[PDB]
Amino acid sequence: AYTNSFTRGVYYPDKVFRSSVLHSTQDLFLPFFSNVTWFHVNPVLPFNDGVYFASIEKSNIIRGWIFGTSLLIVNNATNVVIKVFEYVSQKNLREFVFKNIDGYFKIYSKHTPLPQGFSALEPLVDLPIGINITRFQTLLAYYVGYLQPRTFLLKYNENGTITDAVDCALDPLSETKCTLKSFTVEKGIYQTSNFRVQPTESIVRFPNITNLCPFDEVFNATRFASVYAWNRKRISNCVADYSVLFKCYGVSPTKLNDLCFTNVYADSFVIRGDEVRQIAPGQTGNIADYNYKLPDDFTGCVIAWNSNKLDSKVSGNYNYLYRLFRKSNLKPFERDISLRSYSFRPYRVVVLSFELLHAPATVCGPKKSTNLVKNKCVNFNFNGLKGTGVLTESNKKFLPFQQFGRDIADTTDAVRDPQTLEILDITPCSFGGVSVITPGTNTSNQVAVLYQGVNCTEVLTPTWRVNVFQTRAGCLIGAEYVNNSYECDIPIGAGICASYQQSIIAYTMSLGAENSVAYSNNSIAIPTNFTISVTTEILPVSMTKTSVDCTMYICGDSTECSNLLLQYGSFCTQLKRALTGIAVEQDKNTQEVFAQVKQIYKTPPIKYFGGFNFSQILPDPSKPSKRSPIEDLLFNKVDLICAQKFKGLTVLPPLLTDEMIAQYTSALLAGTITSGWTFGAGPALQIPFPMQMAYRFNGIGVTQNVLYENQKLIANQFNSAIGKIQDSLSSTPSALGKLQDVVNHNAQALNTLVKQLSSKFGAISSVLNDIFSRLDPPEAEVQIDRLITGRLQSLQTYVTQQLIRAAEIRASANLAATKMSECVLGQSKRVDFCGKGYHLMSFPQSAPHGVVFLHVTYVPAQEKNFTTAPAICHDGKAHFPREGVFVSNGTHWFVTQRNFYEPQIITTDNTFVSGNCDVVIGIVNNTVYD
Amino acid sequence: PVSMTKTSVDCTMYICGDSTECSNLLLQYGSFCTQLKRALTGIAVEQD
Ligand SMILES: *[C@@H]1O[C@H](CO)[C@@H](O)[C@H](O)[C@H]1NC(C)=O
Ligand SMILES: *[C@@H]1O[C@H](CO)[C@@H](O)[C@H](O)[C@H]1NC(C)=O
Ligand SMILES: *[C@@H]1O[C@H](CO)[C@@H](O)[C@H](O)[C@H]1NC(C)=O
Ligand SMILES: *[C@@H]1O[C@H](CO)[C@@H](O)[C@H](O)[C@H]1NC(C)=O
Ligand SMILES: *[C@@H]1O[C@H](CO)[C@@H](O)[C@H](O)[C@H]1NC(C)=O
Ligand SMILES: *[C@@H]1O[C@H](CO)[C@@H](O)[C@H](O)[C@H]1NC(C)=O
Ligand SMILES: *[C@@H]1O[C@H](CO)[C@@H](O)[C@H](O)[C@H]1NC(C)=O
């Protein structure tokens, strides 16, 4: 019988209290939705890595368990009895988790008065036992599941209770949740992991020679050569079994059976005891200078054993001579047989040298050999060259002295088979990135998966599996390709986007609606109306000013680390200097954006401006902050601090307060409302607002009367647009994404810096006191230096990224200052610099870390077709319009301004004469009234 | 110039490249590869 484990089996991984957080734990868990064995009410079940044991009964039928390949637990009303050591202490679902880790036996449990719910198991007992549990059996409907190494994302409420968990490896959505460290996923595409084709078989290819090497002749020879004339023997074409046989250089003896050698030579002699220390690289002495000198870069093994009952003589042996005088010290592996005696009375040394650097293998250890598997991802081993990949028949042309082929990275990419002598390419097994496309968990749990840079024929590391489509970006699984084209929702790549239609669809993105302009050589479209448009532009100006405490981040009130940290010195001095430069740059950015005017202009008491209503951008006196309603909305629209501060990371306040920035903004607004563009170029010259509007209409080539004749309509359009600004900002949550992105970048950088303190950087632990109170001080300094270099590197990376982000923010602030000068303090002719349309004016509003420009532009509307001519022929003279264009109803001919239909009688006062009617192409006969 | 090549790096494959022992050792160096992946993803998005 089998059942679903649902989301049961979660226990508390430690004794730590965590409050209202999400924590990631690697531990032995019961995988979600596992297949759990079911029993009704006693087989002997295995104990693989720990056990989840649940039961649903109302009669206490189950009583205990016996653990062993011994340990016994019985739950009796008197006490629960544990016996191996001894210990004594103490329908409804009862769940237990049994683990045997690090010599300790741990039991977690819970009781609930399988169900489709979540309930964590609190720890029950920990016992020092020490036995090797391999099987277990219950003692008396119970369910059994098995633990596996897994990463879980557990959520702790404010009470420290685990209320939910995510099994990261269960499915793509869970992997995305674990990647984002949240239970909620916004719509988008997320790089989650890498897929890698896993090897199927392990192949071994060693030479077929099965003869054993003549080691015994070297070692068991009755007499050994004298050290001055040491013997050298070549080992070739044999199996070297080192178990028959010890200081090894460049290799470990316990691994010597697993490697292939090429130039192996045994050098044998007999020496006098202590000079054993002189058979070594670099060593000096009589033997190491005049008899036997090893290379500085010597790899191989020196094996020496005392031969007392082999060579000792009661009279003094004279068979072993040595060179006691010489001109100059020998070169490595150089012999001189051109001399004293030891006179041994009541040590044989052999030096094995070999080359492990590629080359054909002449001597190989005993490893057996298997078949040669091709076209499949396998773990291969060619003469000691281990690896994983696909082996294919080659078109390369090797040479007899060549055994391996190498690529740019000095990586072996082609190999000659030791037996068949064929050449094989080695490619790595197929792999790539994996992206998850989600419409958002608030919408659906449905996902699509993109395997990047890989076609669908080879689509494993993610261990989950998942409406198959091929794109230049890779293989898309879980999305249906539709022939319709929509605006891009989730970008996939190469023109392919994804969207949530009930289902996930992939499509070719559209660039917009096709449009054809009715072009002809004599037709012109002229607007007859206009719309006053007010658009919003949001610009970051400054970032958070950050300061870092050197020792508090690196050491954290540890004195040995603090004393060790002064061996670098200039590092964090320059780090603090860079951060201080960034902070003063932030204050400079704010100053250059908002302090353009030196007078603080006040808005007049009476707030009549010819029908224009500025109440939503002017300061609101009732509110204590004196902010405008739109500024109020902006500032509402955008314990961790203390925790970061306790690690040396603090935030400095900006020099200008939000109130002072609001004062600057209100001064700019009052200046522009009461004096137009004059206060930017000199003394503020007052002018009625309708007259300033007429000036700005003249700026964009529209005559003044157009605004005076449409004053009420223009004011109403402006008021309506300003009122819609509030709704557009408030309804849209993504409106202020730039400033929030600045805030989130700062927060993410700080969080990364904080979480790098748990990084060990390859040391025993990430805690200094553990290293200092559990290790020799000579090695404690080494490991603490490892940690210190890691943390200093983290700080330097943080500062470098802060400098790059500060440069980007400085560019943004320079652009904002330019827009303040050119869009707020004047009227700009630069296309699209101050909003879409013909710029009229702009109003600044302060925002938490930036500025918001409200651009008021003139957009032509209600265009009409007319027939046009370059010139009008009259009295043999060509007339060209002075400040307009010639248009026609169809019968009569007028002249009009270009951006607003205002037909006028063609007179000699709105045209000018140039030449006859013989050169201009398209000239039209008509009357020019005088 | 308007954009540059969008690059992605498989941190483990570059550093270790089929060596599982190297991967286990590399898992002890923290979120280095996570930071690099985030930075490169930001660059790639900025190109588009
Ligand atoms: C993937 O394999 C299919 C089938 O052989 C092939 O048509 C396709 O071109 C391959 N992908 C690429 C990128 O070449
Ligand atoms: C002017 O446009 C018309 C229609 O678009 C075309 O037939 C005519 O050839 C054009 N004029 C000249 C000189 O080509
Ligand atoms: C211009 O458009 C406005 C709406 O913005 C409308 O009330 C007005 O009647 C229009 N005028 C003309 C001449 O079409
Ligand atoms: C200006 O607009 C606000 C908001 O729409 C409104 O409450 C106020 O009465 C208006 N003032 C005038 C003078 O129309
Ligand atoms: C101008 O004429 C073209 C072709 O006759 C037509 O497609 C277009 O809609 C006209 N424009 C207006 C504003 O009516
Ligand atoms: C031509 O313009 C005059 C305006 O003075 C008037 O007859 C009419 O608006 C136009 N004719 C036609 C057919 O539209
Ligand atoms: C315009 O007038 C001139 C001379 O008066 C004549 O030659 C020409 O043909 C006229 N244009 C048209 C389109 O009739």
UniProtKB/Swiss-Prot annotation, chain A:
Segments of this protein annotated with the region Integrin-binding motif: 272-274
Extracellular side, ranges: 1-930
Result of altering Q26H: In strain: Omicron/EG.5.1
GO biological process: endocytosis involved in viral entry into host cell; entry receptor-mediated virion attachment to host cell; fusion of virus membrane with host endosome membrane; fusion of virus membrane with host plasma membrane; membrane fusion; positive regulation of viral entry into host cell; receptor-mediated virion attachment to host cell; symbiont entry into host cell
Disordered: region residues: 196-212, 358-380
Applied biotechnology: Main component of the anti-COVID vaccine Chadox1/AZD1222/AstraZeneca; in which the human tPA leader sequence is added in N-terminus to enhance protein secretion.
Pfam family, one: bCoV_S1_RBD
Outcome of mutating L321Q: In strain: Omicron/BA.2.12.1
Gene3D superfamilies in UniProt: 1.20.5.300, 3.30.70.1840, Single helix bin, Spike glycoprotein, N-terminal domain
Effect the entry attributes to changing R94K: Partial loss of biliverdin affinity
Domain BetaCoV S1-CTD: from-to ranges: 211-366
Ranges where the record places region Immunodominant HLA epitope recognized by the CD8+: 317-325
Misc: Variant D614G has become the most prevalent circulating sequence in the global pandemic since April 2020. The mutation is associated with higher viral loads produced in cell culture and animal models. It would not change pathogenicity nor neutralization properties vs vaccination. May be prevalent because the mutation increases virus transmission in human population.
Record remark: domains: Contains sequence and structural motifs very similar to those of a bacterial superantigen and can directly bind and activate T-cell receptors. Activation of a broad T-cell repertoire may be involved in the hyperinflammatory syndrome in acute COVID disease. The KxHxx motif seems to function as an ER retrieval and binds COPI in vitro.
Database matches in HAMAP family: BETA_CORONA_SPIKE
Protein name: Spike glycoprotein
Organism encoding this protein: Severe acute respiratory syndrome coronavirus 2
